[PDB]
Amino acid sequence: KPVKYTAAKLHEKGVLLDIDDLQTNQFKNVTFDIIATEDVGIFDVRSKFLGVEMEKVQLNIQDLLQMQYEGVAVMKMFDKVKVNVNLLIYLLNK
């Protein structure tokens, strides 16, 4: 089943840098569900707010590794959600 993380936990870990327009003390109210897809190497990440799904993104491990090799440290995984590439790779793969 999905693995779930709050934005607060990801922020503590360094995976998450910030969420635009959301006060930091409200990060507990955002959760990210990480789901393996049928294609091994593609991950389905869902962004929830107060349990409501707001956005969904598919991430390809080869693309993330390419970013890493090219020195891209951070990325907007969702329109308002900034994440660290290296730590995201580890989160998806640990």
Half-sphere exposure of 33 (CA within 13 A, CB side): 15
> In the chain, how many domains are there?
1
The resolution in angstroms reads 1.5
C-alpha 82/C-alpha 15 separation (Å) is 9
Residues with Cβ within 8 Å of residue 19, at least 6 apart in sequence: 7, 27, 30, 80, 81, 82
Which amino acid belongs to residue 18? D
CA dihedral 71→83→5→87, nearest 10 degrees, is: 20
Residue whose tokens read 């090799």: 69
Do the beta carbons of residue 38 and residue 64 sit within 8 Å?
no
Using what technique was this structure determined?
A: X-ray
Do the beta carbons of residue 83 and residue 18 sit within 8 Å?
no
Q: Given 3-state DSSP classes, what are the helix, strand and coil percentages for the chain, each rounded to the nearest 5?
A: 35, 45, 25
* Phi, psi of 20, deg, nearest 5: -60, 140
Structural domain including 20 reads 1-94
